[PDB]
Design a binder for these strands. Structure first.
Lengths: 167, 84
RNA sequence: UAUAUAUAAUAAU
C-alpha cells in the first residue's frame, strides 16, 4: 500500500505495455501498469506506471539498471508531485573528447546530490555534439554551481547552463 | 505551483489568435498575460498560446467554467505555471 | 548548442 506503484522514466520512444510488462515481470509479480508510449498512434512522453503488487519488486527494480531498447531507462518508485516539481535540471555545455557517463555522473555526484544526471550520446539519438545533463532534488544546488559556470573537467572545461529557464 | 492559474491553447488554427483567444478565455473575467506562437523550429506546435489569468480567483471561475471545451482538435487545457 | 515524462504546453538564443 505505502509502496508498489513506480514511475518508469527514460523509456525508449518505442515500447508497449504487454511488452514493458513481459520485460519487467522478470523480477517478481505485477498486477497492472499504465504505459503511455504508443508507437501505433505515433509517440508520447516516455514513462510508464508500474503497479508492482509486491512493494519488493519496486526496491530491486529501482535498485537495478536495465536496458529495454538498449537506449537508457531510469526506473524509480513513484515520486511525490511536490518533490518532482522541486527537482531542478541543468544542461552542461562542452565536454572531454571521449568521456563516458561513468565519470560525469560520478563527477557532479559530489556536490548537490544527483537524482538524475548523465551524458547524452549519438546512440541516444545522434547528437553527440558534446553536452551533458544534471538533475538535483532542489534548485539551491543549481544556483550554487551556477556561480561556477565553466568547471574544470577531465581535459576540457564544461560550461554549465540552466536546463533552459534563463531565470 | 497550484493546480490552476494559466490556460494552454494548443490545437487551435490560425483562425483565432491573440485577438480571439484574448476573449475566448477572458470569457469570464479579467486575464493577465497572453502569448501566441507557432512551431518555426520544433516544426510541430501549430497554434500555441499561453493565457495567464489573475490567479486562482479568475482562474477558478475561468478554468472551472471554461478549460476544455469543443475547440480546435483538442480542448483548452488547465494551465498553472507562474512567472515571477 | 542540447534534453524522452507523471497521461498537457508556443517562442528564445
Amino acid at each position: 500500500k505505502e509502496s508498489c506503484k513506480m514511475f518508469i522514466g527514460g523509456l525508449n520512444w518505442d515500447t508497449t505495455e504487454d511488452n514493458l510488462r513481459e520485460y519487467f515481470g522478470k523480477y517478481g509479480t505485477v498486477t497492472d501498469l499504465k504505459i503511455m508510449k504508443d508507437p501505433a498512434t505515433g509517440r508520447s512522453r516516455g514513462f510508464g506506471f508500474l503497479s508492482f503488487e509486491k512493494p519488493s519488486s519496486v526496491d530491486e527494480v529501482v535498485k537495478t539498471q536495465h536496458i529495454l531498447d538498449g537506449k537508457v531507462i531510469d526506473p524509480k518508485r513513484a515520486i511525490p508531485r511536490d518533490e518532482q516539481d522541486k527537482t531542478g535540471k541543468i544542461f552542461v555545455g562542452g565536454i572531454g573528447p571521449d568521456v563516458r557517463p561513468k565519470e560525469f555522473e560520478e563527477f557532479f555526484s559530489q556536490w548537490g546530490t544527483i537524482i538524475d544526471a548523465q551524458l547524452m550520446l549519438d546512440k541516444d539519438t545522434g547528437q553527440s555534439r558534446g553536452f551533458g545533463f544534471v538533475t538535483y532534488d532542489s534548485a539551491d544546488a543549481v544556483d550554487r554551481v551556477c556561480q561556477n559556470k565553466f568547471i574544470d573537467f577531465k581535459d576540457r572545461k564544461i560550461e554549465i547552463k540552466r536546463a533552459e529557464p534563463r531565470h | 505551483n497550484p493546480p490552476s492559474r494559466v490556460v494552454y491553447l494548443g490545437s487551435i488554427p490560425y483562425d483565432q489568435t491573440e485577438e480571439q483567444i484574448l476573449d475566448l478565455c477572458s470569457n469570464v473575467g479579467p486575464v493577465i498575460n497572453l502569448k501566441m506562437m507557432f512551431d518555426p523550429q520544433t516544426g510541430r506546435s501549430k497554434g500555441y498560446a499561453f493565457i495567464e489569468f489573475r490567479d486562482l480567483e479568475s482562474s477558478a471561475s475561468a478554468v472551472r467554467n471554461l478549460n476544455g471545451y469543443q475547440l480546435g482538435s483538442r480542448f483548452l487545457k488547465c494551465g498553472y505555471s507562474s512567472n515571477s
